[PDB]
Design a protein around this ligand. Structure first.
Ligand SMILES: Nc1ncnc2c1ncn2[C@@H]1O[C@H](COP(=O)(O)OP(=O)(O)O)[C@@H](O)[C@H]1O
Lengths: 242, 435, 322, 97
């Protein structure tokens, strides 16, 4: 925007060359990083698929070898980036844009080859049938980082917009809705004891069901006092509602 | 300079520098004024130098000076110190890559590395199969920043072949100083290996077009692009030539204007001692497959060398053009015996002798024209085997129909003539209905 | 005689010789105790394998018969010959009830689908065709092979058909959707014969190859492919990987199959020998000097302990197993 | 394979480049017939969901508005008319001056 505003200024004629050079470099860094962010995300949620699954090697051997080679190339490029982490240095890397394009193409080719694996993982957690292939890949691959899984709980549950987690992000303490209403699990579910996504998700849903049952029992016990009562005071009713 | 870089705390001193320079000057004169001549001429030049120089020289009464290199410390050290008796791996026997170290081999490798380091065009001259390509590739293995591209010249070779090679492996880029031709990859020097530089035909006015083209690119550093008449300058492009002696049939002497830019090294056939060393090493590596046969390595190598020598002497290019024998046939001999011995868990001496005779027949008798030559080859194979392998079953090893095939078995084993005939008849019956 | 362990023994039972031309293939009748052999004299002779007595000849083909097969009930016999025709035989009345044309050249294989309502055949015009039994109409044409298709064999449930060709590859097709499921290309020469793995050997194959048990419970169909490079290779159709390579024949492999008990591999080659392979240890147990010339085919009876091998010497032999 | 509207809505929902923090307006400038607009019945209702045949359901973000710019509604059904708020632009709204 600043470059364009300088362009429309009358004093731009003396500064045409270097302003155009800066426009070119900004356009090139944008073009590089737009594909870079996507490539990074795809590698992030494909490495989890290809490492956390022990039987994917036997189910999809050729694709496993292809992804191992692609990941090796990506780690080599990442090490080259970390050697000189300057934005201009990585920009000036010989064929960095072309490498990013071929990486995106290869990751897309691998991603489309993980269909049957997803359609089979849906059998473990039944609610995965209502989740798209890209979303399912993001869920399964990024099971370790549960911070970014909060946006996928609305597609699997009626009102569980997000889950409640401890500081370590290793034990599920409860669930939350879109309005901020929270349900605290009576027995919190630990992800460490059940590392796989589907088992601890099933434990979370079962704990939600039993927790709502127990809280319904407690609420019924509390509200039977309000029944068969000639007069009810406001404050206790309001605090019971809250 | 490299020694000084290796020793930052103790740079080269003046006395060590002068000693090194004097010894290297004598060594360079010897290898520059006689590198394109036989061993006897090199010895004569060394004797003349010893008679006329004042530089300190090796004290050995009979060893010629050319056998001594110049160590960086400034003293004469024999080339024999860099030729260890290696033990080749069994799976790398007679492989194209493996090179058995030899005095001539190490001397020529050092000479080529000296010439190739300056990007100076050079020519290797010698009889076919002497080891010119082997030595060049071995020297180029010591220069990781060089890519070699092989071109094979013929009687019809024209600069168009070089232009196609340049189009494939190089790119024409426009620069402010003009058009520059450089290899597509960066930081590497392209080496053009022309295997038959002296075959291209001379016109009726005694000029080879491709030789003049190469001379123009070497002396003037470039050529003219005939599409737009634009001068093109070469960058990071090097030339290496190989050729048979000009006295050989079909070979033409190179122009004196071309020869001034290219030093010439003469790579002659290895002597009987060098051949014995190389192929005894190969046989020792080969014969470790069968432990019971390890004691027969030396007689086997001696028989191979003797038969090769007599075949080379008896059949020459005077009789037939294809009567060319070289260490290449010895390498093929070793490779054939090795491939015949790989699947065999055990084998008596007679079986080894039969394989040796079969490979000798397949290498030295297939190309023969007249029947008398083939009879000579048969009789002399028998005599050589008897001489170098006494006290063996003559009839069991040299039943005249020496046939080997893997058609009747999973492995390469001797096959009877009648069984082979029946099998070929059945296979022909299938062949008629199929092909 | 362990009910799933017998292997053939070098004392032959009978050496039936009535053919005037090399015997192409030999099969067993699934229900009756009867044996059928096809030869290059355009005749399909029928033998009794208990008493070694010739019964009758099924003629009608013009040129050499290349393959014969039975349906599950054994009530129909399908034979293909070099005259580009496939004939369906009513084995009860021993008459040709239907002759099917449509292949453009020599037909080298034929097989009846396990459902029995379709016939699959492979020929030299690089195509595999499917024919209705009832109408004789061609309904499918599996194209994709680049050379002469030598064999075609359906799996146990009939959903997959495998084929081998002169193009040195083995292809597995899907009958329902005509697509090529996999293209198994590791043989260095022309592939002659193929055979599917029975369900009784799935556990044995999985434990011999070291393959970990799949969470689905099905190890996946396994395929064998004898070829002219004197090797036998076991494949995993689901993954397309060669589980093992069996080496030891001295010539081109002509036939290969499993023991009905799923513990051994029986194979015949042109090295004049019949070999029994222990794929558990990937080694050959027993070698039988079956015939005096090339051995063209073999069959293993499902229940009775009997092995039959045809040969180019115009002799069909029955082997007792002990 | 996502369609044009599905791709746009999914890109907005993902918010890889901060799409959710903007004001996203999807304007359907063209003719309306029940063949394509009835697929937006769940989108324009209180469900705020775009249900696809593959079982995927895309929630409508609160910052996304579905817009239709049409010249007539002689083919739209009552279900389509019922689910949206109409603003009527008579030709007298834009005078020649
Ligand atoms: N010292 C050595 N060690 C191993 N092999 C050798 C040695 N000297 C000669 N040879 C054999 O001689 C052959 C040389 O042939 P080559 O170099 O191709 O001849 P040219 O260069 O004239 O074409 C090689 O095949 C190699 O096996």
């Amino acid at each position: 925007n600043s470059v364009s505003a300088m362009k429309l200024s009358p004093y731009y004629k003396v500064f045409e060359e270097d302003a155009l050079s800066w426009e070119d470099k900004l356009n090139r860094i944008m073009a590089l990083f737009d594909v870079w962010i996507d490539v990074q995300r795809r590698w992030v949620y494909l490495e989890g698929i290809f490492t956390g699954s022990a039987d994917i090697k036997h189910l999809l051997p050729v694709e496993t070898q292809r992804f191992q080679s692609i990941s090796t190339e990506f780690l080599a490029l990442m090490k080259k980036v970390s050697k000189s982490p300057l934005v201009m240095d990585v920009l000036n890397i010989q064929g960095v844009q072309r490498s990013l394009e071929r990486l995106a193409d290869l990751l897309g080719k691998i991603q489309k080859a993980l269909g049957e694996y997803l359609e089979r993982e849906r059998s473990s957690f039944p609610r995965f049938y209502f989740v798209g292939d890209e979303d399912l890949l993001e869920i399964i691959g990024n099971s370790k980082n549960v911070a970014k899984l909060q946006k996928h709980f609305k597609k699997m549950f009626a009102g569980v917009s997000s889950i409640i987690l401890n500081e370590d992000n290793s034990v599920v303490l409860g669930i939350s809705s879109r309005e901020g209403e929270e349900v605290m699990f009576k027995t919190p579910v630990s992800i460490t004891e059940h590392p796989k996504i589907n088992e601890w998700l099933t434990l979370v849903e079962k704990e939600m069901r039993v927790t709502l049952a127990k809280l319904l029992a407690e609420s019924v016990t509390e509200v039977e006092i309000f029944g068969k009562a000639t007069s009810i005071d406001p404050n206790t009713y309001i605090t019971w509602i809250d | 300079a490299q020694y000084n870089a290796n020793h930052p705390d103790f740079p080269m001193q003046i006395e060590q520098l002068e000693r090194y320079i004097q010894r290297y000057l004598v060594y360079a004169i010897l290898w520059s004024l006689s590198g394109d001549s036989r061993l006897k001429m090199r010895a004569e030049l060394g004797e003349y130098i010893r008679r006329i120089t004042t530089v300190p020289l090796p004290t050995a009464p009979n060893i010629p000076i050319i056998d001594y290199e110049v160590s960086i410390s400034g003293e004469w050290s024999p080339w024999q110190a860099k030729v260890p008796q290696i033990e080749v791996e069994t799976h790398k026997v007679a492989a194209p890559d493996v090179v058995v170290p030899t005095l001539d081999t190490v001397r020529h490798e050092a000479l080529l590395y000296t010439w190739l380091a300056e990007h100076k065009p050079l020519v290797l001259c010698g009889p076919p199969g002497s080891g010119k390509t082997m030595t060049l590739f071995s020297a180029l293995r010591a220069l990781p920043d060089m890519e070699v591209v092989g071109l094979n010249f013929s009687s019809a070779t024209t600069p168009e072949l070089l232009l196609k090679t340049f189009d494939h492996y190089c790119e024409y880029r426009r620069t402010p100083n003009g058009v520059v031709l450089a290899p597509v990859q960066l930081g590497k020097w392209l080496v053009l290996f022309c295997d038959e530089i002296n075959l291209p035909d001379m016109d009726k006015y005694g000029t080879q077009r491709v030789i003049s083209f190469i001379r123009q690119m070497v002396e003037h550093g470039g050529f003219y692009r005939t599409s737009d008449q634009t001068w093109v300058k070469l960058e990071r492009i090097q030339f290496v030539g190989a050729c048979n002696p000009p006295t050989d049939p079909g070979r033409k002497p190179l122009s004196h204007r071309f020869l001034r830019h290219v030093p010439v090294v003469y790579v002659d056939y290895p002597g009987p001692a060098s051949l014995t060393q190389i192929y005894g090493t190969f046989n020792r590596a080969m014969l470790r497959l069968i432990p019971s046969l390890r004691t027969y390595a030396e007689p086997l190598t001696a028989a191979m060398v003797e038969f090769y020598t007599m075949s080379q002497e008896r059949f020459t290019q005077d009789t037939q053009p294809h009567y060319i024998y070289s260490p290449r046939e010895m390498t093929r001999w070793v490779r054939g015996i090795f491939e015949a011995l790989r699947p065999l868990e055990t084998l008596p001496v007679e079986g080894l002798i039969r394989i040796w005779a079969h490979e000798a027949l397949r290498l030295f008798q297939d190309r023969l024209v007249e029947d008398e030559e083939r009879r000579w080859t048969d009789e002399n194979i028998d005599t050589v085997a008897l001489k170098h392998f006494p006290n063996i079953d003559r009839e069991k090893a040299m039943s005249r129909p020496i046939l080997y095939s893997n058609w009747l078995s999973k492995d390469y084993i001797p096959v009877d003539q009648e069984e082979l005939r029946d099998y070929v008849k059945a296979r022909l019956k299938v062949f008629y209905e199929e092909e | 005689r362990d009910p799933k362990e017998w292997i053939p023994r070098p004392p032959e039972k009978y050496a039936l010789s009535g053919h005037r031309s090399p015997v192409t293939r030999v099969i067993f009748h699934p229900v009756f105790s009867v044996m059928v052999s096809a030869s290059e004299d355009a005749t399909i002779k029928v033998w009794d394998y208990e008493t070694g007595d010739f019964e009758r000849t099924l003629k009608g083909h013009t040129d050499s018969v290349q393959d014969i097969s039975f349906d599950h009930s054994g009530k129909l016999l399908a034979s293909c010959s070099a005259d580009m025709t496939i004939k369906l035989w009513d084995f009860q009345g021993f008459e040709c009830i239907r002759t099917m044309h449509g292949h453009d050249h020599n037909v080298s294989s034929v097989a009846i689908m396990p459902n029995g309502d379709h016939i699959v055949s492979a020929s030299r015009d690089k195509t595999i065709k499917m024919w209705e039994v009832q109408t004789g109409y061609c309904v499918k044409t599996f194209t994709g092979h680049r050379e002469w298709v030598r064999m075609v064999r359906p799996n146990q449930d009939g959903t997959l058909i495998a084929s081998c060709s002169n193009d040195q590859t083995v292809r597995v097709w899907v009958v329902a959707t005509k697509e090529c499921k996999a293209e198994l290309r590791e043989h260095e020469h022309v592939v002659e014969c193929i055979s599917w793995a029975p369900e009784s050997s799935y556990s044995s194959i999985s434990e011999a190859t070291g393959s970990e048990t799949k969470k689905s419970g099905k190890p996946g169909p396994f395929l064998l492919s004898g070829s002219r490079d004197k090797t036998i290779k076991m494949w995993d159709v689901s993954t397309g990987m060669c589980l093992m390579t069996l080496v030891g024949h001295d010539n081109w492999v002509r036939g290969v199959l499993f023991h009905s008990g799923g513990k051994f591999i029986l194979s015949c080659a042109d090295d004049k020998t019949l070999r029994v392979w222990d794929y558990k240890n990937k080694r050959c147990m027993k070698t039988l000097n079956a015939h005096e010339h090339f051995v063209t085919s073999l069959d293993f009876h499902k229940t009775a302990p009997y092995v039959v091998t045809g040969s180019v010497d115009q002799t069909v032999k029955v082997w007792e197993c002990r | 394979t996502d369609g044009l509207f599905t791709h746009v809505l999914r890109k907005i929902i993902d918010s890889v480049r901060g799409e959710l923090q903007k004001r996203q307006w999807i304007v359907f400038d063209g003719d309306v017939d029940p063949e394509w607009v009835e697929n937006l019945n769940s989108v324009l209702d209180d469900n705020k969901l775009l249900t696809l045949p593959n079982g995927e359901r895309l929630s409508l973000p609160p910052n996304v508005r579905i817009m239709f710019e049409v010249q007539d509604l002689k083919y739209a059904t009552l279900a389509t008319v019922s689910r949206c708020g109409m603003v009527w632009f008579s030709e007298d709204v834009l005078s020649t001056d």
